[PDB]
Design a protein around this ligand. Structure first.
Ligand SMILES: CCCCCCCCCCCCCC(=O)SCCNC(=O)CCNC(=O)[C@H](O)C(C)(C)COP(=O)(O)OP(=O)(O)OC[C@H]1O[C@@H](n2cnc3c(N)ncnc32)[C@H](O)[C@@H]1OP(=O)(O)O
Ligand SMILES: [Zn+2]
Length: 417
C-alpha cells in the first residue's frame, strides 16, 4: 500500500573498477592501485581557496559537534523535493562517528576563515572488515589450482568507512566534493590505510553489491495521512477501509519470546560471540571487539535499541534497531516520522522471523511508525511473512582501491548508514 515515487570527470581517475562489466569479471579480491607507502603521500593538505581553511572538529566539544549538526541539518539533503527530511541528532552523530579508537583526523571539514562558518564535511571511521575473495570464487579458484592467490587477502583488514559527505548548498556543483574525497584519501593514506568502504543511493563506479529498501508499516493510519502510504482501491470497497487497513498491519502488543529484555553491559561478551558466529557466515562482514559491540549495540536512548533473549543464564538471541526520524513537510497533523532501521541480530534458539516479529512489536510499543531495512544479511527471508513491502530506494555498496567480484546483498553482513 506504499506510495511509490522515484561521464565521470573525477571518478574515472580513481582506483575503483570503472564499469559494471569490469566488476562482473573480477575473480580475486585485491588492491587496485600500485603499492605505496605513507612517505609517498603529500604532507600538506590539498589546496583550497584562501578564504577557506581545513578544520578538524573536536567531537567532545559542544560547539564543534553543534557546528557539524547544523551543517548536516541544513544541507545533508539527498532530495529537496521529498516530503521528508532525515534528522541526525548530535547523539546519533557521536554514535556514528566516534566509535572506540576513532581517528579525529578522519573527520574532515572546510570552514570559512573570516567567520569560521562550516561549509563542507566528510567523515571516516575505522572498521575491521573481512573482504577477501568470496567463498564461491575461492572454491572455484582452488579447483583451478589458484587457491593461495584466492585466499591471499582473507585476514580481516583495518580500513576506513566513509559517510556524511556534505557540501553546503551555497557551494554546490563547484567540484568541492572531489576535493573532500581527495583530502580524506590523503589523510587516511597517511594513517597507513589504503581501502575504504562506503554506501550511496546514487550509482557510481562501481558497486560490488546493491540492495533494495523494504518497509514495514507500524502506524498505518499515520503513514497514509502523511502520504508515505496509500490506501489502495480495493479498500475503497470495504465498510471502514481505514479500520480494515489498521487490522491488516496489526501486531501483538507484547513480544512472543519469554526472556526477552533490554541488552545490558554485562551481555556484551556473549552478544559479541553469537553475532560474530553469525556474521562470519557472510563473504563481506565486520569484526567487532567487546568495546565495539558495547559502543554500537548498547541501548542509547533516541539512537540505538537492543534486546536480548536470555531464557535463564545464557544470551541465545538478540536484535537491535536504530532510529532516524524524518521531518514531514507541510502536514497539518504530523511533523515527524519515527523510523526504526533494522541493525544487527543473531538467532540461535528461535526462527529468525519470530525474533524480528518481536523487533516489530517492541519498535511499535516504543512509538515507531515504520520499520525500514535493506535486504542484506538474511533480511530478505522474512519480508513476506512479516509484511514488509519494497521501497523505491537502493543502497549501493562500494570499495575504494579494492578489486572485488559482484556479489548479492545477501552476501553482505556490514550494516552501513
Ligand atoms: C583509502 C581511503 C579512501 C577514502 C575515500 C573513499 C571514497 C569516498 C567516496 C564518497 C562516499 C560518500 C558516502 C556518503 O556520504 S553518501 C551521501 C552523500 N551526501 C549527500 O547526499 C548530502 C547532500 N549532497 C551533497 O552534499 C552534495 O551534492 C555532494 C557532496 C554529495 C556532492 O557535491 P556537489 O553536488 O557540490 O558536486 P561537486 O561538483 O562538488 O562534485 C561532483 C562529483 O561528485 C560526485 N559525487 C556526487 N555525489 C557523490 C556521492 N554521494 N559519493 C561520491 N561521489 C559523489 C559526482 O559523481 C561528481 O564526480 P564525477 O561524476 O564528475 O566523477
Ligand atoms: Zn508521488
Amino acid at each position: 500500500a506504499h506510495h511509490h515515487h522515484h561521464a565521470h570527470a573525477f571518478w574515472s581517475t580513481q582506483p575503483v573498477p570503472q564499469t559494471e562489466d569490469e566488476t562482473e569479471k573480477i575473480v580475486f579480491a585485491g588492491p587496485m592501485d600500485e603499492p605505496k607507502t605513507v612517505a609517498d603521500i603529500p604532507e600538506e593538505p590539498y589546496p583550497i581557496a584562501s578564504t577557506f581553511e581545513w578544520w578538524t572538529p573536536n567531537m567532545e566539544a559542544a560547539d564543534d559537534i553543534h557546528a557539524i549538526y547544523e551543517l548536516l541539518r541544513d544541507n545533508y539533503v539527498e532530495d529537496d523535493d521529498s516530503m521528508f527530511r532525515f534528522n541526525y541528532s548530535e547523539e546519533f552523530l557521536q554514535w556514528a562517528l566516534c566509535p572506540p579508537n576513532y581517528i579525529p583526523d578522519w573527520h574532515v571539514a572546510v570552514r570559512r576563515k573570516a567567520d569560521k562558518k562550516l561549509l563542507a564535511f566528510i567523515a571516516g571511521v575505522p572498521v575491521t572488515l573481512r573482504m577477501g575473495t568470496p567463498k564461491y570464487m575461492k572454491v572455484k579458484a582452488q579447483e583451478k589450482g589458484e587457491g593461495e592467490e584466492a585466499a591471499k587477502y582473507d585476514e580481516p583488514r583495518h580500513i576506513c568507512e566513509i559517510n556524511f559527505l556534505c557540501v553546503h548548498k551555497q557551494l554546490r556543483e563547484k567540484r568541492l566534493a572531489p576535493i573532500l574525497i581527495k583530502e580524506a584519501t590523503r589523510r587516511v593514506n597517511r594513517t597507513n590505510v589504503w581501502q575504504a568502504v562506503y554506501t550511496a543511493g546514487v550509482l557510481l563506479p562501481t558497486p560490488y553489491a546493491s540492495g533494495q529498501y523494504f518497509h514495514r508499516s507500524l502506524n498505518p493510519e499515520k503513514l497514509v495521512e502523511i502520504r508515505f502510504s496509500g490506501i489502495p482501491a480495493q479498500y475503497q470497497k470495504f465498510q471502514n477501509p481505514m479500520a480494515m487497513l489498521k487490522r491488516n498491519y496489526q501486531l501483538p502488543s507484547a513480544p512472543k519470546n519469554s526472556g526477552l529484555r533490554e541488552m545490558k553491559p554485562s551481555d556484551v561478551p556473549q552478544v559479541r560471540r553469537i553475532l560474530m558466529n553469525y556474521l562470519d557466515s557472510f563473504d563481506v562482514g565486520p569484526v567487532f571487539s567487546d568495546a565495539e559491540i558495547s559502543h554500537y549495540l548498547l541501548p542509547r536512548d533516541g539512537v540505538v535499541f537492543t534486546y536480548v533473549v536470555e531464557n535463564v543464564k545464557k544470551v541465545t538471541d538478540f536484535f537491535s534497531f536504530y532510529r532516524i526520524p524524518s521531518t514531514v513537510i507541510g502536514n497539518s497533523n504530523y511533523n515527524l516520522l519515527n523510523a526504526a532501521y533494522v541493525h544487527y541480530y543473531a538467532a540461535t534458539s528461535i526462527p529468525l522471523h519470530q525474533l524480528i516479529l518481536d523487533l516489530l512489536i517492541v519498535a511499535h510499543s516504543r512509538g515507531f511508525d515504520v520499520c525500514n531495512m535493506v535486504e542484506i544479511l538474511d533480511n530478505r527471508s522474512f519480508v513476506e511473512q512479516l509484511k514488509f513491502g519494497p521501497g523505491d530506494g537502493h543502497l549501493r555498496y562500494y570499495f575504494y582501491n579494492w578489486a572485488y567480484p559482484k556479489i548479492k546483498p545477501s552476501q553482505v553482513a556490514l550494516v552501513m548508514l
